Design a protein around this ligand. Structure first.
Ligand SMILES: CCCCCCCCCCCCO[C@@H]1O[C@H](CO)[C@@H](O[C@H]2O[C@H](CO)[C@@H](O)[C@H](O)[C@H]2O)[C@H](O)[C@H]1O
Ligand SMILES: CCCCCCCCCCCCO[C@@H]1O[C@H](CO)[C@@H](O[C@H]2O[C@H](CO)[C@@H](O)[C@H](O)[C@H]2O)[C@H](O)[C@H]1O
Ligand SMILES: CCCCCCCCCCCCO[C@@H]1O[C@H](CO)[C@@H](O[C@H]2O[C@H](CO)[C@@H](O)[C@H](O)[C@H]2O)[C@H](O)[C@H]1O
Ligand SMILES: *CC(=O)N1CCN(C(=O)C*)CCN(C(=O)C*)CC1
Lengths: 150, 17, 550
């Protein structure tokens, strides 16, 4: 009983929305804005006079880099990076609903090419934000059903 | 080093020996 | 306001009895200092630790300066050394000023490579193989960013540094139906050794892409251009010892063409769970990059990247810009998701592979594979996440490579978590010996402590008792050697006005080259704080800290 997705990834009530964050020029804001523009969402400034526009407020993100495994000498073998992002979708009449994204990545350590590993780490972080943005978009319908349930 | 031939478009997309 | 905190004691096998007498100094708002005498009995001296926390318009920062004037153990192990003093300087600053300026500092510098194996691991770890020293100043606006940074590394076990590196990004989204961007970089690579090559690299990368989308499908076409210029000096020593000669001036020009496509199908899970939705998402990507012989360029900052499921669709095989592998490949994957009646995603599983029409080459192909496979389906990846309930969750991933003729890597985890205090977690990590031999230096493949790979099983648990006691335990074990890697216990009693925690840890702390076995460190310490039950703090105290997996 498979069929093509007849609805949109972003709900029709969120096709025009306000993107707000404390770091509008940061990487997470850029990734979220690109993701929202991908599904044809019209982004507005927070000072606009148009009412009944839901607002997506991006919270502070946390990136942790821990040791997942070690070698026989106790040296780090694999590093695990965890990115946690919090956000709130405020529908003005109804309510504010929190959402979050957690992204896990891994990479092996190499002191002999440590600088190269640093570059790799940067690339991994540049991927992780994108994944987080996708997760945020995938939490958009669940908010909408929560708006319909109440 | 080397210098590109006349057909820059085709030569840009070719592989190296 | 400012005075003496409660002194705290410890017993380790590295320094025997250890005593801490902290003093807190509130210099002003946004300015705290902490002066800690730390008496170590085995080393027979006092290390002075100075912490400084500040908040300013440029951001938040923390400096640490630990100084031990002399060390008896270090003197005995290094009797020919001039001085036995040890020290550590750490500085972490992060800030965004006026929404445009970004200041970052992550600087660690120790006196000797054996510092973190002998002293407390507050801003460093004994698992670390090097110390990072990074400065970065950036200007970022909505369509532009320019960052200048310096990266240096102190290796504990020759290293290259970018002194300095400049990155520029420009974006323009509405050029007709196309999105356009340009990336530029200028880096100077310097080595600690005086006989290794030095480089200056300038890179330009203009990219254009046409995106198209429906409610069910999406397709993105991308054309990118890479132009790099290398000026290399100090090539005499390298060229006198290698048959392949480095070039003083190098120009690498190459285009890249990529096509990505995704589809989404939906169906109703009528038989299993009415109201539940199942989505099937096939994704394909064709990538072409012509082959350029890069053997005349030294590899400064390019390392092979891990290929998980998300990494299958990556357009780069190496990080950095010194090595750019030729590509003629198609990546195909499928992701299945299961959402409940409330549109909440409960399950996802992804499986994908990469098919190579031609061999991926960089001109310098020294990585040791287990077989001569060059084309076909060589890389497979899989991932899975299942939120079984509100308290149960399981994650897993696997990476298989036919060139290794083995599973490259794998990881799994199952966690129950009722709240912040009640949790259990089981995790497994695996990396094959073939992967270690392929992606790591040769002495890793020849050394006892490296060659066997990773086969690690970890168990973590935390339980409250009587709403005032918290017990935390962790055990990480190596199945290849059948030996313990890490073990931790911790019990805390929390009251209205104070809390007392006692912790014990046994960890791998080094390797003995003489008898060819691992060294273990045991540490038992008490701590009293003036007043949660502290479960999360105790869970993050060992060398393999706990991370929540839902
Ligand atoms: C919307 C963004 C803008 C997109 C603009 C279009 C940019 C792409 C232009 C067409 C080139 C890409 O297409 C790519 O062409 C090269 C040409 O070398 C083909 O490559 C093939 O070409 C010839 C065949 O005789 C050989 O020299 C080469 O070794 C072989 O690989 C690739 O199989 C194809 O994938
Ligand atoms: C497609 C979506 C789902 C993919 C994700 C699945 C979860 C990830 C796999 C975890 C399973 C446990 O991890 C698994 O451990 C065994 C050994 O312990 C490894 O097996 C490997 O080492 C053993 C050593 O005993 C060898 O006999 C075996 O030939 C070799 O493949 C697997 O390669 C690894 O995957
Ligand atoms: C997830 C919950 C479970 C984890 C929580 C429990 C944590 C405790 C894990 C069990 C391991 C700790 O127990 C560990 O046993 C080893 C056995 O080699 C002993 O280790 C060492 O102790 C002394 C001193 O060197 C020697 O007498 C002994 O031979 C040596 O092995 C210690 O007793 C302790 O280091
Ligand atoms: C001279 C040179 O470095 N290039 C141009 C030569 N050509 C060509 O088709 C005109 C193909 C090979 N090439 C290599 O890098 C080996 C591309 C650069």
């Amino acid at each position: 009983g498979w069929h093509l997705r007849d609805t949109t990834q972003v709900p029709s009530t969120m096709k025009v929305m306000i993107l707000d964050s404390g770091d509008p020029n940061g990487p997470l804001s850029r990734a979220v804005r690109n993701q929202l523009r991908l599904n044809g969402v019209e982004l507005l400034d927070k000072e606009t006079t148009r009412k009944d526009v839901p607002s997506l407020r991006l919270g502070k993100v946390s990136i942790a880099k821990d040791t997942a495994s070690v070698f026989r000498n106790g040296q780090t073998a694999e590093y695990q990076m965890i990115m946690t992002v919090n956000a709130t979708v405020l529908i003005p009449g109804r309510d504010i609903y929190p959402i979050s994204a957690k992204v896990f990545r891994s990479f092996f350590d190499n002191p002999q090419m440590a600088l190269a590993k640093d570059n790799e780490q940067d690339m991994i972080v540049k991927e992780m934000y994108d994944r987080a943005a996708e997760q945020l978009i995938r939490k958009l319908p669940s908010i909408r059903a929560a708006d319909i349930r109440s | 080093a080397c210098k590109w031939e006349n057909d820059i478009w085709h030569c840009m997309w070719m592989d190296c020996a | 306001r400012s005075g003496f905190l409660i002194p705290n004691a410890k017993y380790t096998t590295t320094n025997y009895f250890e005593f801490y007498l902290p003093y807190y100094w509130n210099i002003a708002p946004n300015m705290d200092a902490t002066i800690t005498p730390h008496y170590m009995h085995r080393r027979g001296n006092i290390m002075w630790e100075n912490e400084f926390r500040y908040l300013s318009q440029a951001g938040a920062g923390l400096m640490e300066l630990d100084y031990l004037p002399s060390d008896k153990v270090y003197e005995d192990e290094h009797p020919n050394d001039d001085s036995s003093r040890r020290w550590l300087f750490y500085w972490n600053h992060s800030g965004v000023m006026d929404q445009v300026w970004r200041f970052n500092v992550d600087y660690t510098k120790v006196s000797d490579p054996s510092y973190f194996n002998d002293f407390d691991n507050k801003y460093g770890s004994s698992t670390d193989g090097y110390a990072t020293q990074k400065f970065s100043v950036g200007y970022a606006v909505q369509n532009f960013n320019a960052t200048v940074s310096t990266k240096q590394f102190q290796v504990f076990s020759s290293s290259y540094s970018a002194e300095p590196q400049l990155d520029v990004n420009y974006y323009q989204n509405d050029v007709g139906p196309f999105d356009t961007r340009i990336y530029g970089q200028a880096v100077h690579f310097v080595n600690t050794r005086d006989d290794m090559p030095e480089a200056t690299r300038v890179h330009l990368e203009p990219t254009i892409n046409l995106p198209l989308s429906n409610n069910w499908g999406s397709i993105n076409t991308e054309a990118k251009f890479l132009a790099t210029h290398y000026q290399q000096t100090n090539l005499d020593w390298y060229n006198s010892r290698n048959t392949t000669k480095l070039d003083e001036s190098v120009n690498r020009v190459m285009p890249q063409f990529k096509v990505d496509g995704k589809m989404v199908f939906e169906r109703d899970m009528e038989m299993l769970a009415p109201g539940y939705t199942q989505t099937l998402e096939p994704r394909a990507q064709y990538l072409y990059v012509p082959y350029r012989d890069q053997s005349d360029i030294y590899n400064y900052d390019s390392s092979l990247l891990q290929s998980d499921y998300s990494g299958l669709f990556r357009d780069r095989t190496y990080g950095g810009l010194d090595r750019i592998a030729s590509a003629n490949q198609v990546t195909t994957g499928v992701t299945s998701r299961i959402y409940d009646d409330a549109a909440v995603e409960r399950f996802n599983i992804s499986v994908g592979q990469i098919y190579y029409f031609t061999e991926s080459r960089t001109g310098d192909d020294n990585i040791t594979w287990e077989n001569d496979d060059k084309t076909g389906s060589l890389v497979w990846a899989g991932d899975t996440y299942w939120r079984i309930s509100e308290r149960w969750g399981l994650r897993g991933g696997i990476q298989y490579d036919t060139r290794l003729d083995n599973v490259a890597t794998s990881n799994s985890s199952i966690e129950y978590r009722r709240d912040e205090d009640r949790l259990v977690q089981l995790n497994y990590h695996y990396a094959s010996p073939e992967y270690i031999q392929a992606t790591l230096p040769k002495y890793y493949s020849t050394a006892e402590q490296y060659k066997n790979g990773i086969s690690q099983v970890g168990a973590v648990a935390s339980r409250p008792i009587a709403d005032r006691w918290s017990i935390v335990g962790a055990y990480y074990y190596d199945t290849n050697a059948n030996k313990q890697a890490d073990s931790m216990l911790g019990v805390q009693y929390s009251s209205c006005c104070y809390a007392i925690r006692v912790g014990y840890e046994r960890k791998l702390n080094g390797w003995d080259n003489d008898k060819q076995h691992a060294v273990y460190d045991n540490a038992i310490g008490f701590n009293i704080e003036l007043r949660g039950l502290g479960t999360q703090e105790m869970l993050r105290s060992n060398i393999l800290p706990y991370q929540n997996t839902l």
